[PDB]
């Protein structure tokens, strides 16, 4: 319902609220299915590379999948 109502948001805050809602939906997916969570994580990272929680969660999921074989990514994020 929040995503449906996002169409009525003012354009100034529309980008920020869309990023927030997409992050929340990606969290719900990560609870349900990690693949869609990672997809939305990539979508938001392309949309806003400056955000940290998205990158943290994406790298954390990658480390879970790669058994901590992305130490370079963690160092770069640090």
């Amino acid at each position: 319902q929040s995503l449906e109502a996002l169409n009525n948001v003012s354009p100034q805050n529309k980008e920020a609220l869309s990023i927030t809602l997409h992050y929340n939906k990606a969290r719900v997916e990560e609870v349900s299915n990690q693949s869609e969570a990672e997809k939305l994580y990539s979508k938001l990272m392309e949309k806003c590379p400056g955000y940290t929680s998205n990158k943290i969660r994406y790298i954390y999921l990658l480390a879970l999948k790669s058994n901590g074989n992305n130490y370079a990514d963690v160092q770069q994020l640090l």
Binding site: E15, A16, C48, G50, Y51
Partner: peptide, 6 residues
């Protein structure tokens, strides 16, 4: 520096 991030 991004006003969006702020």
């Amino acid at each position: 520096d991004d006003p969006l991030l702020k």
